[PDB]
Symmetry: D2
Subunit: 250 residues, 4 copies
C-alpha cells in the first residue's frame, strides 16, 4: 500500500511541485487549494492519468476563524477518506502581503489571513494529523529571511516566526509518536505573479549562488529529503534553501 500526503496550497507554484514530487516518489496526494479550483482539478487529473486514484482535491479557507479547526480536521479526514491513511503533512499555503505599522481589508482580517495561513492552520492541521495517528512526518514551509524581514511585513513575519516555534514545539511533543517535524526555508524562489520585472531582477541579482531564484523543484527536493528514510533521525530542523541570500549583509 502506497503512503499518502496532504500538501496545502498545492494547486500552483511551490505547492504544486511538492505535490508532483511526492507523487513521483510514490505518494498518494491530497491537493488542498483555496481559490485555484481549475489548477487543482487539473493537477489531480494529470497525476491520476499516471496512476489512477492517487490524487484528490480538497478545498478550504485557511484564514483563522472559529471554524478553522473543523476545516483543518476535514482536510486530514479527506486524506483518510480517499486513501485510508495520512503519512505526510506539508504546510505550504501562505498569505503574503504588506501590513504597514503606520498609514481594503480590516487589520483583523489581515491578522486572520496572515497569522492563520502561516501559523494557526499549520498548528491545527498538526493536531488533527497527530490525533488521527511507518515514516510519519510534517514539513512546514518557512522563510530563510525571517531575521532580515521585508519592510512593512510585520504580520507576515510574525506568522513565519510562529511557524518556526510550531516546528520546534511539535518536533519535541510528537517525537514520542514517531512523527518528525521539520521545515524548509526558501529565500527567493518563484517570485510573486504581481511583482514587477525590475523588482524580480533586483532580488535575483542579490543571490550569491547563481544570481537567480530557486525553482519550485529545488524547494520540493528539500521536502522529499525530509520525508524520506534518509532523514529518519532528523526532527526540529529547518533547512534553508536560499542560495546564500540570508548570508549577504545590507
Amino acid at each position: 500500500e502506497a503512503p499518502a500526503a496532504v500538501v496545502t496550497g498545492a494547486a500552483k507554484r511551490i505547492g504544486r511541485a511538492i505535490a508532483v514530487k511526492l507523487h513521483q516518489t510514490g505518494y498518494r496526494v491530497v491537493i488542498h487549494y483555496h481559490n485555484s479550483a481549475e489548477a487543482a482539478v487539473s493537477l489531480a487529473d494529470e497525476l491520476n492519468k499516471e496512476r489512477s486514484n492517487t490524487a484528490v482535491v480538497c478545498q478550504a479557507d485557511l484564514t483563522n476563524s472559529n471554524v478553522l479547526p473543523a476545516s483543518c480536521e476535514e482536510i486530514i479526514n479527506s486524506c483518510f477518506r480517499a486513501f485510508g491513511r495520512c503519512d505526510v503533512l506539508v504546510n505550504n499555503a501562505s498569505a503574503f502581503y504588506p501590513t504597514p505599522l503606520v498609514q481594503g481589508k480590516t487589520v483583523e482580517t489581515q491578522v486572520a489571513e496572515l497569522i492563520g495561513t502561516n501559523a494557526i492552520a499549520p498548528f491545527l492541521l498538526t493536531m488533527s494529523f497527530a490525533q488521527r495517528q511507518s515514516n510519519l512526518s510534517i514539513v512546514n514551509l518557512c522563510d530563510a529571511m525571517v531575521d532580515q524581514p521585508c519592510m512593512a511585513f510585520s504580520l507576515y513575519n510574525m506568522g513565519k516566526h510562529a511557524l518556526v516555534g510550531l516546528t520546534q514545539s511539535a518536533a519535541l511533543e510528537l517525537a514520542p509518536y514517531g512523527i518528525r517535524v521539520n521545515g524548509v526555508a526558501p529565500g527567493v524562489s518563484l517570485l510573486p505573479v504581481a511583482m514587477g520585472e525590475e523588482e524580480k531582477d533586483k532580488w535575483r541579482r542579490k543571490v550569491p549562488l547563481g544570481r537567480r531564484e530557486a525553482s519550485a523543484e529545488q524547494i520540493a527536493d528539500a521536502v522529499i529529503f525530509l520525508v524520506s528514510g534518509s532523514a529518519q533521525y532528523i526532527t526540529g530542523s529547518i533547512i534553508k534553501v536560499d542560495g546564500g541570500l540570508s548570508l549577504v549583509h545590507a
Copy 2:
C-alpha cells in the same frame, strides 16, 4: 516635563516592578490590567501618593477579537489623555498555559495565547507609532528555542513577538522609535507551585541557582528605554542567569 509609559499587565509581578521602576526614573505611568483591578488601583494609589497625577489605570482584555484594535487604540489614547504624551510602551501582559497537540475551545486558546503575546503587542505598536527617546520594550522568553513540553501556542506567541520586535525595529527606526526585547528565563514562579517544583527550576540556573526577581527583569527594561541605549534597536536582551545555555 516628565515622560510617560504604558505598561501592559502591570498590576502584579514583573509588570508591577516595571511600572514602579519606570515611575522611580521619572515616568508617569499607565497601568494596564485585565482582571486584577484591586492590585492595579492599589499600585496607582501608591505611585500617586509618591507624586500626584503620575499614575492612571486602564482595563482591557487583550485576547484577540474584532474589538482588540479598538482596545489597543484606547490604551494608547489613555496615556495621551492623562499625560499629553506617550514615550514608552512595554508589552508585558501574557497568557501562559499548556495546549497539548494530542473548558476553553482551541480557538479561544489561540485568541488568548497569540492575542496577548503577539497580536495585542502589534496593535499597540501600530497605535503607539500612529500617535507620534521613544521606545517599545517587548517581554519575550529566553527559552523559545527549548520550549516547555505541550506549550505550542504560547511558544508560537513568543516566537511571533520576536518577529514583531525585529519587524517594528526596522520599520519604526526612520521615526526614531527603538523596539527591543527583554527575555526572562525563569523569574517569579507561580504562587501555588510547590517549593519542591520551584526548586527543580532554581537548581537549573547556573548563576546563583535561583530565579530572577521581577526587579532584575525591570532593570533591563530601564536600560533599554534610557539614553544609554540610544543606538540599540531590534535587540533582545536575555536576563536568564545562563539558563538557556544549559543542555538537557
Copy 3:
C-alpha cells in the same frame, strides 16, 4: 567519469560511514587518517575490492602548526593525483576533550582543538577552492548553543567552523562551490565514555531515546553533496533527534 571526495578522519566511526556511503554513491575517495593507518588501509581495501582503484589513503596531522597549510595543500593534491579531480571535501576530523578554565600545554590543546575543528577546515577549503557539482560539508555540532561543561576550546572550534561555513558559502558561491554543514547531536558515543553515561545521553533524545547511527549522519552529507541540494549553501542541517530542543 567518476567524481572524487576527500573525507578527513575517515578511518573510523562517522568519517568511515561517510566515505563508504560516498563510495556507494559513485565517488572515488581519499580516506584521510592521522593515527588510524591500519583501519584506513582496511577501509581502502574493502572499497577497492568493490571497484578497482577508487580509494586511496592520506596521512596528516591536522593540529595547527607552521606546516599545517602544506599538509592541507597535500591532502587536496593527493585527490587530484589519484583521481584527476576533487569535487567534494568533507571536514570531519575532530579533536574532542575538555579544557577547564579553572599533560598537554594549553597551547597544544589550542593547536589540536582549534586546529582540527576550524583551522584545517579553513586551509583545506582554501586549497580545495584554489585548485578549481562542487561542495564542501563541514561536520559541526547541534549542541553549540548549549555546550558541554568545561569544553570551551572545543566549543570555540565548532563555533569558528559555523563561521567558516557561512563565510566560505558566501565567498565561494561565484565559483559554484556550495558550503554546508551537518550538525550531529549524539551519534556514536566516544569510545572512552562509560556505559552508564552513554545511556544517560541516549535517554535525553526525544526521537527514539537513542543516538544516531554513523550512517544516519552520512545520509545528510550525501543529500548535501547531491544534485538534490543544488541551491543549498550556507546551511547547517541538524541531525539530532530533537536533542537540541530539550530544555534542562
Copy 4:
C-alpha cells in the same frame, strides 16, 4: 575601596571609550595596548589627572604563540599589582583585515586574527578566574557575524569563536559568580584607513539615524553589563547596531 578593570586594546577608539567610562563610574583601569604607546600613556595621564593613581598602562602582543598564556596571565597580574584586585575584564583588542580564500603568511594571519579575537580572550578569562563582589567579563563581539564581510573568513571564525567562549565561560564560571557577557557593534567607529565615501556607504545602511555608533554608545552597553543592574545577566550578547543586522541584501 574602588574596583579595578582591565580593558584590552584600550589606547584609542572603542577600548579607550570603555576605559574612560569605567573610570567615570569609579573603576581603576589597566589600559592594555600593543603598538599605541603614545596614546595609552596620554590616556593614563588624563585619567590620573582626574584621580591620582587610578590608571596604569600594560603592553602586550595578543597574537597567538606559545608565550601567549604567560602574556595574558601577566595582564591580569598587572591589575592586581597596580590595584590589589581585578573585578572586570573587557576583551576589546582585535585584529581586523581580509583573508581571501582564493607579506603575512597564512599562519601569521591565523595567529593574529584567531589569537586577538578568541585565544587571548580565552586565556585572559582563565587567568582572570584563576586569580580570584561584582565580577564580570565583557567580550566585544560583532553583530554582523551571520552576515559577514566578504573575504573575512578568519576574522569571522575568530568572532564566532568569541561567541562560543562567551557562552562556555558564562556556564562554567557562573558557580564562581563571574558573569560573562558580550557587546556586539554593527558599525561603530569606521577604520582610519577608510575614505569618507566608503564610510558613508556603511552609514546609509543603518536604519536608526543612518550613522555609526559612537564609541560612547558601545561603552554604555559595556557599562550596563558590568553594573548591578545586570546582576542576573550572564551568557548574553547585546547587539548595539542601530538595526543594521536586520536589513536584508
